[PDB]
Amino acid sequence: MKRTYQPSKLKRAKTHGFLARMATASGRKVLKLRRKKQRAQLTVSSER
Amino acid sequence: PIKKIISRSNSGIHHSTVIDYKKLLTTNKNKPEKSLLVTLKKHGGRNNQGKITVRHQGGRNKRKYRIIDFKRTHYDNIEATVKSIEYDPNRSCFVSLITYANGAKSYIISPDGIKVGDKILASEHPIDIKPGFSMPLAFIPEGTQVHNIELHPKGGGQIARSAGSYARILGQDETGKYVILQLLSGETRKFLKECRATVGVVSNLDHNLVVIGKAGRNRHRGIRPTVRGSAMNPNDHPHGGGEGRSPVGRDAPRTPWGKRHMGVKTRNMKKASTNLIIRNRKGEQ
Amino acid sequence: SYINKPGKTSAWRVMTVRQQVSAVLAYGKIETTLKKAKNTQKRLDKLITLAKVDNFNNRRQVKKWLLNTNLFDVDQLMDHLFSKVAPKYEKTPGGYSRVLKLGPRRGDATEMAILQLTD
Amino acid sequence: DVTNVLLKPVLTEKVYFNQMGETKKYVFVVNPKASKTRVKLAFELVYGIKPLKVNTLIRKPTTIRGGSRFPGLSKLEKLAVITLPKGIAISVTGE
RNA sequence: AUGAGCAGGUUGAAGGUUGAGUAACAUCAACUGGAGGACCGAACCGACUCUCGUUGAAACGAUAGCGGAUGACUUGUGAUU
RNA sequence: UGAGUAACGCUUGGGAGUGAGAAUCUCCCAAACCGAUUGACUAAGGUUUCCUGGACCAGGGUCGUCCUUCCAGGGUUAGUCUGGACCUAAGCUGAGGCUGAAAAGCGUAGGCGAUGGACAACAGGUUAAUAUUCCUGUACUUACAGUUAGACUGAUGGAGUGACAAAGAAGGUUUUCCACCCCCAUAAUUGGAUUUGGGGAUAAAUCAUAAGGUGGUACAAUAGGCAAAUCCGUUGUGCAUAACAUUGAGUGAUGAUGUCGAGUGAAUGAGUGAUCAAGUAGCGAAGGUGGUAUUAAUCAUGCUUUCAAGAAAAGCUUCUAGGGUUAAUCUAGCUGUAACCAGUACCGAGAACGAACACACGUAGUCAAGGAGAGGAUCCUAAGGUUAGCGAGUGAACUAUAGCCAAGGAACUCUGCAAAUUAACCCCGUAAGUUAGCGAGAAGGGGUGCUUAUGUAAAAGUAAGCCGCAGUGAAGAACGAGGGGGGACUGUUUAACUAAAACACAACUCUAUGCCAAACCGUAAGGUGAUGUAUAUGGGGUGACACCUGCCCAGUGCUGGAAGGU
Ligand SMILES: [Mg+2]
Ligand SMILES: [Mg+2]
Ligand SMILES: [Mg+2]
Ligand SMILES: [Mg+2]
Ligand SMILES: [Mg+2]
Ligand SMILES: [Mg+2]
Ligand SMILES: [Mg+2]
Ligand SMILES: [Mg+2]
Ligand SMILES: [Mg+2]
Ligand SMILES: [Mg+2]
Ligand SMILES: [Mg+2]
Ligand SMILES: [Mg+2]
Ligand SMILES: [Mg+2]
Ligand SMILES: [Mg+2]
Ligand SMILES: [Mg+2]
Ligand SMILES: [Mg+2]
Ligand SMILES: [Mg+2]
Ligand SMILES: [Mg+2]
Ligand SMILES: [Mg+2]
Ligand SMILES: [Mg+2]
Ligand SMILES: [Mg+2]
Ligand SMILES: [Mg+2]
Ligand SMILES: [Mg+2]
Ligand SMILES: [Mg+2]
Ligand SMILES: [Mg+2]
Ligand SMILES: [Mg+2]
Ligand SMILES: [Mg+2]
Ligand SMILES: [Mg+2]
Ligand SMILES: [Mg+2]
Ligand SMILES: [Mg+2]
Ligand SMILES: [Mg+2]
Ligand SMILES: [Mg+2]
Ligand SMILES: [Mg+2]
Ligand SMILES: [Mg+2]
Ligand SMILES: [Mg+2]
Ligand SMILES: [Mg+2]
Ligand SMILES: [Mg+2]
Ligand SMILES: [Mg+2]
Ligand SMILES: [Mg+2]
Ligand SMILES: [Mg+2]
Ligand SMILES: [Mg+2]
Ligand SMILES: [Mg+2]
Ligand SMILES: [Mg+2]
Ligand SMILES: [Mg+2]
Ligand SMILES: [Mg+2]
Ligand SMILES: [Mg+2]
Ligand SMILES: [Mg+2]
Ligand SMILES: [Mg+2]
Ligand SMILES: [Mg+2]
Ligand SMILES: [Mg+2]
Ligand SMILES: [Mg+2]
Ligand SMILES: [Mg+2]
Ligand SMILES: [Mg+2]
Ligand SMILES: [Mg+2]
Ligand SMILES: [Mg+2]
């Protein structure tokens, strides 16, 4: 069946990318929290 | 006039009717002038926020807007000639590709009764009472049909622009301005002396009698299915809920957003144009 | 339970016998399961006794059983059977083949059997 | 110019297949940020014979030593395939 | 918004041409024309029934039938509420 | 504990070899399924899963010497391909600016944004793994400089083109296909063989010729195209069976003394031999004539009809402006120089993707063989590919899937649920009712095989004869009649228990709305309505078509109203 996640290299980067998060106050706050937790994968940009 | 459609497709029966478009249009082919042709973007009944605002709108076919000269004031004192009566998908009334003496081309709302080769001319002096001639309202004798009436001076035509729409002149006022105009729906208004209008009735007088025969034709025209309020849930509409087919239930019918809307007047009387209205289809003011 | 395997159909059984009998006539030994050797033995003996006259009718009868092998074709197996193998068993009253039991397989524990032409 | 865009020559079966038969093809590894024109200039300033043409390869990094206690990624390589004209064959080692 | 897809086979509308006919219309006959939310039926879309499965092959399917299949159709990519 | 129990998730036999150990690994011969696909090319995604050698801790529902697992090494070559350096659609961002307690929202100029437009390369070969990329052969395009000859050059702006819908049917040329012919191998011990089987090809580019398709052509006046115009538009005149302009599938010649080619087929070396080596290197013949009442591709962004009236910009051509005049620029030719960045492996799915699984599920497009057949339906196979990653027995009860069942034929059951009958083509015949379109493939019947002759371009058919219990002998094809309830109909709906009488629909009616319109999103700006104008828009109710829709204005709701009371 058509499952929920249909992978796309563009949609992912344009929705959860670093530039998408750095365009609104809410995204900057989310990035600040992830830096506080010291997440190695800060955003979906750093896939590898 | 109108012409019937005999489907002879054995899936229901529909006595569909369409405008002839053969004896009313010069060329049956679709050859609009390239210069005055901009494309229309279908909003789909959605505002700038992307939210549905006017329901039951969406799904029409691709159209290209034809620039129409509602003002008809730039090339005054210049004789124009009708070249072709064509079909405009953005208005029920036919549009004529007229050409001016200097070689300029334009589209105007086609008056009824004019044919190819009929001269037109607009200006701000008496001119002549001929069909298509546009002059200010001061010099038009009382009784003649006029369409494309201009509300604001130096503006463009706003009133009586649909197919088969016209208005009658009913004299003047003692003020020295506000010439009386009897419009459709039995409303009497006072239009300023300098306001400009075009004589003649708009073409396509038989747009009332066109009969759609199918859901698909109306869907392709750009109309989405309208769901009645009695079939809704008790949420999203006042007339919802119930156990079976239920009546209105309230004291009066209500809008989806919950106002009475039935028989109540919804005109803002504190408007500068109230004093220019003689009758409102029912009585005075 | 559905979408089951085709299975040991009657057509599959006949084809299995055909393949083993063609191989045992070509090489001379077959290392198979005991229950398959005990069924191929009947067809092997029947083919050998019918191929003792060497007339064209007997060739047509045998050709409904023989299959192509590596060492012989379907036409050279005919020459091998009618000129080399069958003439040897010219006065033997049946029992041209012997089936003997080897040890169990490592992955199945089924009883193997060698089928050979008894000289 | 600075000639830091010629990191290391590489010798494989493919390289030796090309490096015989009249025109020689020498494969080096270069700075991944360098362009073809920079590669030709570097060969000019450090060898002396103008390349006939240059081809470039980008080998993507991949996981190595998978399953080992600490897994590691590869290193980004840009490969350059210089081809000198007919009849000329210079040595990569010895100047 | 921009693209793509619907194997194959039938029915033969409006209209037009010709002839008869009419005082002139109307009407009738032949030919042309190829319309239909037309018909049968694959890909495709959907999910009406029996059986099986219900710690499944599968957090909704399999076999056998079944409805639509030029359209209020199906679908890819991109945007948006 | 259940319990060594259920389960192990669609595919066989044998010979030889390796190995300490083989149903499971390698090779060979068969065998069985796919064959509008399990075949081949790619988009998306996956991210080394690709090739070689080695290993059998772990993973593989068994085993394993083997793996898409692990280790080591290696593998992706572009001026022409897919995208940037070119252009825009929906939409996003958006200096100023508007709006808003703050954060922010809206939005102009600009800038991004393909799923579209413009743009120059084809054929063959080569490695274990790459190939319009490397090699060979033959080409093309865009820049810069020098040079020769000609010409006045003409854009950031104007104009034209670019530029387009759905359906349908005719043509032109190549094809598919048919017949003949050429070439290669074959001549057959099972009864007769006087034959059987296979192949018959060449591209981009250059030159010439082009069936046709599209649209009238020149001259003269001009006040219109943010200035200007010789271009466009407009108005006249002449000639208009044609001319002129543009476009155009195909054909011939080079490209080609090349390449490919059925087949023939080694050496060298490994090995005990066979065999590998390899069916590899190399060699490599013919490489054609006519028809077509059969085929698909192109011309074609061609033509006709219909209404639901069918993208933008870049680019190209042209116009002056503006710049030159003792010059610049452009055109054509020659010589030389240069052509950047990213992707290029492999899978593309009953094992590499989305489903936790080597999961019976799902995933855009392109190529589509033969026989019969309308067909891409159906059966069997071709090119090609796989061995459904637990087997061997037995043929108890019982279960699933199938097949069959004598006499009766719905007696079964809530109900003919399910199953069964019919089924393709051709020839007869076809009622009641009706909105005259339908009902209708109504109902009911008949024929189908093979041979000879006649028929045709081929048929179909016709006449005679023969065989079988049966002749679309197998596969794939509608069971029907009558009465009633509801919905007019085609459609839509509760992803995963309700597909229906429910929703919608064309149609009827009421109501609001004179445009800065009513209604609606927000707090506002702003926006939808609508680049619409009462033949228009929004909301309530009813739901083809035909005939009708009666009484009550007490209460409630709505509209209007003089004064008077609060
Ligand atoms: Mg434009
Ligand atoms: Mg509405
Ligand atoms: Mg409407
Ligand atoms: Mg309900
Ligand atoms: Mg409520
Ligand atoms: Mg209610
Ligand atoms: Mg009730
Ligand atoms: Mg069978
Ligand atoms: Mg590259
Ligand atoms: Mg239909
Ligand atoms: Mg426990
Ligand atoms: Mg236990
Ligand atoms: Mg037990
Ligand atoms: Mg048990
Ligand atoms: Mg068991
Ligand atoms: Mg299995
Ligand atoms: Mg098995
Ligand atoms: Mg098969
Ligand atoms: Mg495949
Ligand atoms: Mg891995
Ligand atoms: Mg491998
Ligand atoms: Mg290995
Ligand atoms: Mg194991
Ligand atoms: Mg090249
Ligand atoms: Mg861009
Ligand atoms: Mg694209
Ligand atoms: Mg490959
Ligand atoms: Mg013989
Ligand atoms: Mg001007
Ligand atoms: Mg590839
Ligand atoms: Mg699948
Ligand atoms: Mg998976
Ligand atoms: Mg499996
Ligand atoms: Mg696909
Ligand atoms: Mg076929
Ligand atoms: Mg099939
Ligand atoms: Mg039977
Ligand atoms: Mg029987
Ligand atoms: Mg019976
Ligand atoms: Mg009976
Ligand atoms: Mg009963
Ligand atoms: Mg009973
Ligand atoms: Mg049934
Ligand atoms: Mg009936
Ligand atoms: Mg009744
Ligand atoms: Mg219904
Ligand atoms: Mg239905
Ligand atoms: Mg459901
Ligand atoms: Mg259901
Ligand atoms: Mg407002
Ligand atoms: Mg608007
Ligand atoms: Mg109703
Ligand atoms: Mg009703
Ligand atoms: Mg009263
Ligand atoms: Mg009141």
Numbering used by the authors:
A (entry chain 0): 1 to 48
B (entry chain a): 2 to 286
C (entry chain m): 2 to 120
D (entry chain s): 2 to 96
What text appears in the publication on this structure?
Chloramphenicol (Cm) is a well-studied ribosomal peptidyl transferase center (PTC) binder and growing evidence suggests that its inhibitory action depends on the sequence of the nascent peptide. By resolving the Cm-bound ribosomes to 3.0 Å, we elucidate Cm’s coordination with natural nascent peptides and transfer RNAs in the PTC. We find that Cm leads to the accumulation of a number of translation elongation states, indicating ongoing futile accommodation cycles, and to extensive ribosome collisions.
Subjecting 30,774 ribosome-containing subtomograms from 137 cells to structural analysis resulted in a 70S ribosome map at 3.0 Å global resolution, with an overall B factor of 85 Å2. The remaining nascent peptide after position −4 could be traced only for the backbone and was modeled as poly(Ala) (labeled as poly(UNK) in the model). For instance, we modeled a number of naturally bound polyamine molecules, namely, cadaverine, putrescine, spermine and spermidine, as well as magnesium and potassium ions.
